[PDB]
RNA sequence: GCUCGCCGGAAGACCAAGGGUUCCUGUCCAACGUUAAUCGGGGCAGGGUGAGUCGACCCCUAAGGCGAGGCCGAAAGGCGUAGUCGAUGGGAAACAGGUUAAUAUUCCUGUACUUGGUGUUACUGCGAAGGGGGGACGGAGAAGGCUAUGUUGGCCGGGCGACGGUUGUCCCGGUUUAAGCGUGUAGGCUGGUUUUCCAGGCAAAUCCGGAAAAUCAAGGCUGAGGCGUGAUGACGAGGCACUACGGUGCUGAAGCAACAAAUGCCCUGCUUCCAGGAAAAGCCUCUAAGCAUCAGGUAACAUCAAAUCGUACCCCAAACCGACACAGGUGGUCAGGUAGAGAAUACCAAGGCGCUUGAGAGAACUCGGGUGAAGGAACUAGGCAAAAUGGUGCCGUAACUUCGGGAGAAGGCACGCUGAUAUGUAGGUGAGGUCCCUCGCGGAUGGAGCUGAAAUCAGUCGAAGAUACCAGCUGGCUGCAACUGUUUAUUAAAAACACAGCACUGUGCAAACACGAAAGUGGACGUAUACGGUGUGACGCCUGCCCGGUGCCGGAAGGUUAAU
RNA sequence: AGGACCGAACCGACUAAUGUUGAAAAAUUAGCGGAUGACUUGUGGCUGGGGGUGAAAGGCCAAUCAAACCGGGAGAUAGCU
């Protein structure tokens, strides 16, 4: 059956990637919480 | 021209294997590990000027590093670059 | 194995399915309730 | 020429076509075409603002000359063409100085026919000229509402506007609505009536024909739940309410004009 | 290794996405593998991915994103002009053969092609975020010409055969060759050329558009395939010499023709139909400012450059998405034989597999199937399930009907094999020869050869000739819904939703209406034959009475009536 | 010609049986509907929570939907167990 995760790298990055978190106020606050929690990978880039 | 300070840092090791060996003893090509940011003009110039031979053409691939592990600790090795340097008819090394 | 066992015990903790008991177990409880009314 | 299709396969049983042998079978004139991307009924916020729109055939826009600015230069009608963006047909015309333009095609106008815009134009159908020079009681289409702006009244097929008065700097116009409106008399207008009247006689026949003009289905309000439409719910068919829009405003009677700026120009509302 | 079975429009082959070393070799069997394991997609180590031509990057753009200024907004921020990004689309160029354990249009051999830089030489008006062309583009249908590919004959090499026969109307195998370059064909489109003039293409224009003449009747554009060359080369069934028996080298015959033939190519064509079918760059042209014995343009030759990243391997799956080595999901490409209308179906080729627990026994019972005396719905909520029907041709076919249907109504008959008509016909294709020449990829004649239905008559076999697989059960009365469609992903596919059609009502354009503190945007580059809302729901005959209540529309006299 | 007819791919999901600590958190097998269209599909884009989208089922919005998920107010409150 066709499950929910149908992967695509270009949609992974355009959607949840770094240049797209940095592109706005609230994604920069996301990166700030991931750095402050101290996190090995911030976004999902590769 | 390429400066000689750049041109010394490019070639890194001769690559020893059996594909390399049959490339030397069968098709004049010496195979050698180069700098990761080394272009084909740099490798050609560096073999022209550091082994004093005449290079016909260079073919460069980039080899991806293998994820090994020690114990239960993984790690990728490291990517390197391998240059197939096709020499002319007059060569030794 | 321990991590997979904790997550695979954590599978039906937030479910919704009402005809299946506990999210997964097949039954006849629809007919039992419906016949009780 | 309207044509009833023979009833092979339902779907064709009720179709009436409006065929026109004088339309150009071929490609339109290219440098008066441009891209016309379809929207889906959705504004710059992405949201559906006008419902029921979407799909349909790909269409290219045709720059139709509504202004009719080339004054005094005659133009022969080169051909007539199908325009997908309108109810009427468009005539491709060729001015004497070698410029082609598309105009709305009036009623009698065929290929090889002289039209002429401007003040000293002859009064005959196809000639755009200001309404202080048109006689009272003449059918007139493609009417401007502000001088220099372009035609906006009576553009849709089979539609005309009658000039009934010339009191001063204004002309009283019986719009196709039935409404009497004052327009400034310097506003150009094209003589005759616009010419595909039989457009209204076609009957479409099946559901997919509506679909291919870009008209998605219309779910009626009473078939929904109360969360969706004010008509909603009720255990079989159940209306019981005064009929409203999906936003609660009364349909079936309730007047929704509020302008106050253009009420000066309305002599009598429609009836 | 020999047999046996399974897939073969896939369970073969090649990719994209996705993964990321799973690829290949050596080595180990702890754990992983639903068993054992010497094996493995497991552990460990080593190896492996070679590009001017493939793809990305790059040039150009769609939807859409972002957006200097800007308009707007308590702040955050919204929208958006110039612009700038964004492929799933447009834009230069390589093919055959060989090779590795593992890469190959990348390496090697042979033969090519493309775009830029620079230099020389000959001629020369060049020049844009500007003008024009072009790129540039729908659905369906129909043939015609081809090819891939296949079949048969010829040729060449080999065999004459475990059991009757098999020197022949016999058996097995091979019969392959590309890009590029040259020619220009079956088609398809368009009249061509010269001169003058002009309110158009923001300016200019020799370009485009337009208006006059004059002359010629042809020119041009495009185009599959074939043919020639590439190629006296490669490949080639097989033999020969050594053989770490794994193979390794050497040598190597024929290498043709006929017919059939695509869903591929001519074809972005042609015919037709409404529902009227991207953009921008490369490309070709025109000039403006400027530069004008310079620069630049064109042509030939030479020379240099073409960087960077991807390239392993799986990819309908044990490697991706499904927690699993999960009976599920996953886009594109190639598509042989026989029978067949066919990409169905049966059996097969190439190729790949036998599904990572086995050995027995042959109880009840469960599951998947086969058959069944007599009866034949008596079962049951209900013919649920099963059984039955099932092909092609011809005959024949009712009520009712919107004249289309109903209709494949219903119901029948024929069907294999052999021989003759006819040493294979009708038809298709069509050589050599002959005739003419505007002479060749020509047309006329001619029929050799190949292919080849279908029908009748005669005979013969079986219980049965649509023999397997595949492949309608039919009829009568009636409710609802007109019809095709849509819907409760995961107990409801329906009479429900939709629908064409009808009506009412709003709406005069800065439209009503909707999203939006606003700007703005959709409505719509539309304009009342249009658009929005509401109900009803093809079609036919129709749609009666009630305005007291609630709503809406209209009226303005009087009563009451806020801020002030 | 056709929201035409029969029928594969392709899309679907009408019936039955199995399965129901499944091979599978919705499938398999045998039949079944559509199959040139209101079709189907790939790649990208847009719409967002009292909001979207809806041929309307209160359906769908990441195995979640009469108001998603995450985090916080938050140790809500619980005359009840």
Tab-separated table of C-alpha atoms (C1' of nucleotides) in Angstrom, chain D residues 7 10 13-14 17 24 27 34-35 39 41-45 47 49-52 57-62 82 86-87 96-100 145 149 152-158 176-177 179 181 197 199-200 203 205-207 212-213 218 220-222 229 231 237 242 244-247 250-257 262 266 269-270, chain E residues 62-65 78-80 132-134 137-138 198-201 209-211 273-279 402-404 482-484 495-510 512-516 519-539 549-554:
chain	number	residue	atom	x	y	z
D	7	UNK	CA	-29.107	11.057	-30.572
D	10	UNK	CA	-26.752	9.875	-24.670
D	13	UNK	CA	-29.006	13.420	-27.439
D	14	UNK	CA	-29.569	16.954	-26.287
D	17	UNK	CA	-24.247	23.213	-31.770
D	24	UNK	CA	-11.366	30.936	-39.979
D	27	UNK	CA	-4.295	29.281	-36.666
D	34	UNK	CA	-0.398	36.081	-25.714
D	35	UNK	CA	-0.289	33.698	-22.805
D	39	UNK	CA	-6.146	30.621	-12.166
D	41	UNK	CA	-10.628	30.853	-8.987
D	42	UNK	CA	-7.804	31.638	-6.591
D	43	UNK	CA	-6.301	34.888	-5.519
D	44	UNK	CA	-2.747	35.927	-4.620
D	45	UNK	CA	-3.427	34.358	-1.203
D	47	UNK	CA	-7.521	30.779	-1.539
D	49	UNK	CA	-12.322	33.341	-3.861
D	50	UNK	CA	-14.742	32.597	-6.686
D	51	UNK	CA	-15.977	29.072	-6.508
D	52	UNK	CA	-16.723	26.614	-9.319
D	57	UNK	CA	-9.174	23.778	-22.138
D	58	UNK	CA	-5.952	25.711	-22.597
D	59	UNK	CA	-6.632	29.161	-24.141
D	60	UNK	CA	-4.486	31.895	-25.603
D	61	UNK	CA	-5.458	35.512	-25.092
D	62	UNK	CA	-6.125	37.718	-28.142
D	82	UNK	CA	-13.138	32.112	-33.118
D	86	UNK	CA	-15.486	35.758	-25.353
D	87	UNK	CA	-19.003	34.934	-26.478
D	96	UNK	CA	-4.408	50.714	-45.098
D	97	UNK	CA	-0.965	51.360	-43.585
D	98	UNK	CA	-0.320	47.651	-42.960
D	99	UNK	CA	-1.349	47.153	-39.311
D	100	UNK	CA	-3.583	44.249	-38.359
D	145	UNK	CA	-17.951	54.787	-20.121
D	149	UNK	CA	-10.658	54.233	-21.784
D	152	UNK	CA	-16.873	48.102	-21.647
D	153	UNK	CA	-20.646	48.099	-22.366
D	154	UNK	CA	-22.292	45.715	-24.840
D	155	UNK	CA	-19.428	43.485	-25.696
D	156	UNK	CA	-20.949	40.004	-25.157
D	157	UNK	CA	-22.517	38.316	-28.184
D	158	UNK	CA	-25.786	39.447	-29.693
D	176	UNK	CA	-29.006	45.672	-22.341
D	177	UNK	CA	-29.895	45.188	-18.683
D	179	UNK	CA	-31.056	50.204	-17.203
D	181	UNK	CA	-27.460	55.180	-17.835
D	197	UNK	CA	-26.565	36.181	-31.385
D	199	UNK	CA	-24.708	31.817	-29.067
D	200	UNK	CA	-27.533	31.755	-26.637
D	203	UNK	CA	-27.318	23.535	-25.250
D	205	UNK	CA	-25.964	18.408	-23.720
D	206	UNK	CA	-23.746	16.817	-21.108
D	207	UNK	CA	-21.783	17.453	-17.988
D	212	UNK	CA	-14.482	21.820	-20.626
D	213	UNK	CA	-15.358	25.362	-20.436
D	218	UNK	CA	-21.921	23.137	-7.885
D	220	UNK	CA	-26.057	22.761	-3.496
D	221	UNK	CA	-26.339	24.132	-0.113
D	222	UNK	CA	-29.042	21.973	1.326
D	229	UNK	CA	-23.582	26.029	4.507
D	231	UNK	CA	-28.670	25.289	4.610
D	237	UNK	CA	-34.483	17.113	2.731
D	242	UNK	CA	-34.750	31.827	4.390
D	244	UNK	CA	-29.007	32.653	1.787
D	245	UNK	CA	-25.501	32.729	0.252
D	246	UNK	CA	-22.906	30.500	1.851
D	247	UNK	CA	-21.986	33.497	3.977
D	250	UNK	CA	-30.049	36.704	1.759
D	251	UNK	CA	-30.346	35.404	-1.840
D	252	UNK	CA	-33.789	35.777	-3.533
D	253	UNK	CA	-34.414	39.410	-3.401
D	254	UNK	CA	-31.914	41.314	-1.348
D	255	UNK	CA	-30.332	44.206	-3.194
D	256	UNK	CA	-26.576	44.351	-2.973
D	257	UNK	CA	-25.660	47.562	-4.754
D	262	UNK	CA	-21.959	56.286	-9.622
D	266	UNK	CA	-28.023	56.008	-13.161
D	269	UNK	CA	-32.486	50.952	-12.421
D	270	UNK	CA	-33.334	47.845	-14.350
E	62	A	C1'	6.243	27.932	-17.154
E	63	A	C1'	3.463	27.294	-12.606
E	64	G	C1'	5.308	29.523	-8.672
E	65	G	C1'	8.986	31.701	-5.108
E	78	G	C1'	1.517	41.484	3.671
E	79	C	C1'	1.613	42.512	-1.561
E	80	G	C1'	4.416	43.751	-5.560
E	132	G	C1'	10.544	41.343	-37.619
E	133	G	C1'	10.824	36.064	-38.506
E	134	G	C1'	11.590	31.530	-36.175
E	137	C	C1'	3.915	23.438	-29.805
E	138	G	C1'	-4.589	20.674	-29.389
E	198	C	C1'	3.653	54.156	-47.678
E	199	A	C1'	-0.634	57.437	-41.992
E	200	G	C1'	2.053	50.652	-39.538
E	201	G	C1'	6.298	47.484	-36.328
E	209	G	C1'	3.752	44.445	-42.983
E	210	G	C1'	1.100	46.990	-46.900
E	211	A	C1'	-0.122	49.231	-52.291
E	273	C	C1'	-13.384	18.744	-35.189
E	274	C	C1'	-14.618	22.219	-31.379
E	275	A	C1'	-13.387	22.446	-26.212
E	276	G	C1'	-9.642	26.535	-30.337
E	277	G	C1'	-4.628	24.100	-28.225
E	278	A	C1'	2.971	27.325	-23.151
E	279	A	C1'	6.843	31.070	-22.774
E	402	U	C1'	-36.719	10.034	-27.557
E	403	C	C1'	-36.599	6.405	-34.205
E	404	G	C1'	-30.515	6.222	-32.153
E	482	A	C1'	-32.818	10.150	-16.803
E	483	C	C1'	-28.002	8.770	-18.915
E	484	U	C1'	-21.366	8.533	-18.468
E	495	A	C1'	-32.438	5.897	-4.489
E	496	A	C1'	-27.277	9.947	-1.937
E	497	C	C1'	-23.679	13.989	-4.746
E	498	A	C1'	-22.964	15.696	-9.582
E	499	C	C1'	-25.037	16.622	-14.223
E	500	A	C1'	-27.125	18.917	-18.945
E	501	G	C1'	-31.720	21.594	-18.703
E	502	C	C1'	-35.218	24.953	-16.006
E	503	A	C1'	-36.493	29.067	-12.781
E	504	C	C1'	-35.844	32.854	-9.126
E	505	U	C1'	-32.641	36.547	-7.536
E	506	G	C1'	-28.337	39.820	-7.264
E	507	U	C1'	-24.892	42.375	-10.327
E	508	G	C1'	-23.813	48.734	-15.014
E	509	C	C1'	-17.915	47.462	-13.926
E	510	A	C1'	-13.518	50.705	-9.219
E	512	A	C1'	-22.135	41.967	-7.119
E	513	C	C1'	-19.229	38.385	-4.354
E	514	A	C1'	-14.831	36.286	-1.984
E	515	C	C1'	-9.709	36.221	0.440
E	516	G	C1'	-7.373	40.334	2.913
E	519	A	C1'	-2.445	47.488	0.097
E	520	G	C1'	-3.893	44.340	-3.166
E	521	U	C1'	-5.796	39.770	-5.609
E	522	G	C1'	-9.570	36.375	-7.708
E	523	G	C1'	-14.363	37.470	-10.258
E	524	A	C1'	-11.991	38.656	-15.641
E	525	C	C1'	-7.478	41.049	-19.184
E	526	G	C1'	-14.602	39.119	-18.633
E	527	U	C1'	-19.186	43.415	-19.428
E	528	A	C1'	-25.839	41.525	-18.618
E	529	U	C1'	-26.296	36.178	-24.799
E	530	A	C1'	-21.811	38.078	-18.707
E	531	C	C1'	-20.885	36.904	-13.822
E	532	G	C1'	-22.412	35.401	-8.597
E	533	G	C1'	-25.922	33.094	-5.206
E	534	U	C1'	-30.148	29.753	-4.489
E	535	G	C1'	-33.462	25.822	-5.554
E	536	U	C1'	-35.103	21.986	-9.001
E	537	G	C1'	-32.657	18.244	-11.904
E	538	A	C1'	-32.553	14.878	-19.408
E	539	C	C1'	-37.017	14.519	-22.097
E	549	G	C1'	-47.325	34.584	10.016
E	550	U	C1'	-41.687	34.897	8.902
E	551	G	C1'	-38.520	37.087	5.086
E	552	C	C1'	-37.648	40.307	0.996
E	553	C	C1'	-38.893	44.517	-2.174
E	554	G	C1'	-41.239	49.393	-2.422
